[PDB]
Design a protein around this ligand. Structure first.
Ligand SMILES: CCC(=O)NCC[C@@H]1CCc2ccc3c(c21)CCO3
Length: 486
């Protein structure tokens, strides 16, 4: 390593210390100052700012002095405490990040189900549990003797080579586990935003339908040359592994032998596999209560169908966003759909029948259950379907930018700490052999990239959040503009 490399690392820490202290003090002040930033959900933000602030006050300055000293001149006590506080900061950061991810996911869910805004009643209570969990994780390292000075990075930290069992547990429980939780939270938020964006209440609206539902159904069934009965509808691509038309076709065959089949009517709409197109056409010939439509219908006629049929069958294997289920629910069509992502998020227990995907027996039984439902039970189901669709459209004028800032805060944390945890696993495999087998440049960059993270969040809040940006300017001016008397 050259001479300039040591001076380069010192610049990174000097920048980190200054931007951490000044920036995170602004983050704390802004939450207190701004009325819009002042909320229970932002207690986790202050807790994360405190976590970041800890390392800048005592650990980082000792690391900076150690670069110029080219060794540890502060004894064992300062080495033990400096390493312990680095643990509390790093562990506290990832768990506060999960705390925000769970808080935000619970916010969108509350916003859909209720008219009153989400108030994080136990926000401070969860923050106190995070620091009780953080303390429980970093404390065993003092008695285990896994905290020591590393000459390569000029600091006292957790030695990945002391105990592999401690190293693996740190990676698994305090990186992999929190990440899985966070990814699941932001993936579920993103799908719910696309469903809010996707729905169109100006098109999929009962206002466009003139007559009564019973009148519209009798008219629809008469056009297809069928009498009155519980009408079921399918509208999807004909394939063997995605939309599940094959599950529906096999379910009709199971039902055809039953005495209850006479009371049923089926409208299968779609195109795809010619073999599946033939199977549907075969059932259409054998049974006068089964009608197949292979041509492509207009949105106008599909909307007419949703407002006429009793049930919409969504027997999909994989469905990311159940826009079809919401569009059907808009016009009071009760969905019988597979318990798959998107569909499980849309269809509640009071707004439809949920079925195990890829089971023709479970679908046939669900169709039998749907059949034995009186006009009164049906009217309440349709009412609930409409109420559920309304809550999605309700969230359209909302500003979803805060969800993006929080996601960037996490994404940058993951980028900063991913190489360190990968090196951790590589060292844990063979502590004696992998220590020289790992390049010094990679090890040094991974630690200082992780250190640089302690000053990133105040920069992110300023660049992406308008409330934080406005307050940074407000505080900077207020503290530098003198009061005078003319
Ligand atoms: C796999 C290890 C890794 O890459 N990163 C965690 C090292 C962090 C940062 C400093 C510090 C101090 C004490 C402590 C821990 C840490 C984990 C639990 O005890």
């Amino acid at each position: 390593r050259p001479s300039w490399l040591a001076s380069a690392l010192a610049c990174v820490l000097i920048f980190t210390i200054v931007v951490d202290i000044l920036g995170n003090l602004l983050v704390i002040l802004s939450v207190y100052r701004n009325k819009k930033l002042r909320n229970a959900g932002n207690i986790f933000v202050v807790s994360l700012a405190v976590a970041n602030l800890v390392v800048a006050i005592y650990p980082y300055p000792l690391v900076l002095m150690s670069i110029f000293n080219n060794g540890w001149n502060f004894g064992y006590l300062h080495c033990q405490v400096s390493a312990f506080l680095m643990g509390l900061s790093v562990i506290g950061s990832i768990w506060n990040i999960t705390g925000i991810a769970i808080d935000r996911y619970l916010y969108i869910c509350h916003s859909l189900k209720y008219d009153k805004l989400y108030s994080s009643k136990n926000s401070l209570c969860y923050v106190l549990l995070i620091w009780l969990l953080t303390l429980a994780a970093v404390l065993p390292n003092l008695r285990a003797g896994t905290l020591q000075y590393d000459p390569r990075i000029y600091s006292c930290t957790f030695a990945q080579s002391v105990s592999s069992a401690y190293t693996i547990a740190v990676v698994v429980f305090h990186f992999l586990v929190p990440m899985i939780i966070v990814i699941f939270c932001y993936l579920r938020i993103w799908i719910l935003v696309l469903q809010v964006r996707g729905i169109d209440c100006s098109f999929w609206n009962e206002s466009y339908l003139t007559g009564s539902r019973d009148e519209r159904k009798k008219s629809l069934l008469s056009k297809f040359g069928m009498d009155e009965g519980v009408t079921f509808m399918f509208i999807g691509r004909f394939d063997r592994g995605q939309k599940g038309v094959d599950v529906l076709l096999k379910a009709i065959e199971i039902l055809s032998s039953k005495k209850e089949f006479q009371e049923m009517r089926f409208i299968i709409i779609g195109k795809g596999d010619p073999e599946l197109e033939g199977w549907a056409r075969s059932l259409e010939e054998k049974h006068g209560n089964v009608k197949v439509i292979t041509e492509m219908l207009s949105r106008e006629f599909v909307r007419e169908l949703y407002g006429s049929v009793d049930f919409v069958i969504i027997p999909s294997y994989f469905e990311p966003f159940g826009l079809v289920a919401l569009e059907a629910m808009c016009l009071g069509a009760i969905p019988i759909a597979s318990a798959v992502g998107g569909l499980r998020d849309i269809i509640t227990n009071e707004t439809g029948i949920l079925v195990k995907a890829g089971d023709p027996g479970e679908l046939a039984n669900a169709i039998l259950k749907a059949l034995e439902l009186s006009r009164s039970d049906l009217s309440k189901f349709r009412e609930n379907c409409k109420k559920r669709a309304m809550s999605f459209s309700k969230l359209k004028p909302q500003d979803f930018r805060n969800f993006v800032t929080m996601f960037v805060v996490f994404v940058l944390f993951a980028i900063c700490f991913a190489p360190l945890n990968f090196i951790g696993l590589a060292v844990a495999s063979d502590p004696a052999s992998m220590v020289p087998r790992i390049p010094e440049w990679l090890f040094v960059a991974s630690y200082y990239m992780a250190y640089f993270n302690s000053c990133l969040n105040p920069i992110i809040y300023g660049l992406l959040d308008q409330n934080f940006r406005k307050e940074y300017r407000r505080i900077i001016v207020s503290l530098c503009t003198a009061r005078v008397f003319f």
